[PDB]
Amino acid sequence: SARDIHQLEARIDSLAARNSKLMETLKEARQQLLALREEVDRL
Amino acid sequence: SARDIHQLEARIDSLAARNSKLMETLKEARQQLLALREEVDRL
Amino acid sequence: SARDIHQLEARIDSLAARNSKLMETLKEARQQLLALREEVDRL
Amino acid sequence: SARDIHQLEARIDSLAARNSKLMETLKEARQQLLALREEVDRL
Numbered sequence A, B, C, D: 001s002a003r004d005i006h007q008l009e010a011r012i013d014s015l016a017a018r019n020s021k022l023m024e025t026l027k028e029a030r031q032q033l034l035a036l037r038e039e040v041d042r043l
Helices: A002-041 B002-041 C002-041 D002-041
Strands: none
Touching: A002 B002, A002 D002, B002 C002, C002 D002
């Protein structure tokens, strides 16, 4: 069943890649929100 | 000040685009987790 | 072995619960961003 | 109008709090995915 384990592994690896994509996208959003809050004060 | 508002709007629009990107990525993660739960069951 | 499976299933279910938590939180953020964009316009 | 800005600030603060909630939840999902990948290998 090495077949079964590498199939489960490929799937977990995929989920882990989407997790990293989510985190990097959230980090950019945090930066933009902070800039938005400074821009609202400059006004 | 049209200047100010159009700059605030550009930033909110960017945040809304990242919000959509996060949601589509999370929808794909849900699909993959569901398939992982069925693959685990099968064995 | 079903011991192994129940442990794997408990972990996947936990990940699925966090996935739902992320999606509901993102849905609230989308609504707030839309209201922010309407508030900016009104001014 | 001072309260135009405090309304906008309140809304941005709320979005930033949801952003932190998303990141914390995602950091927990990453840890659990990593443990799942180790548990699958134990098999």
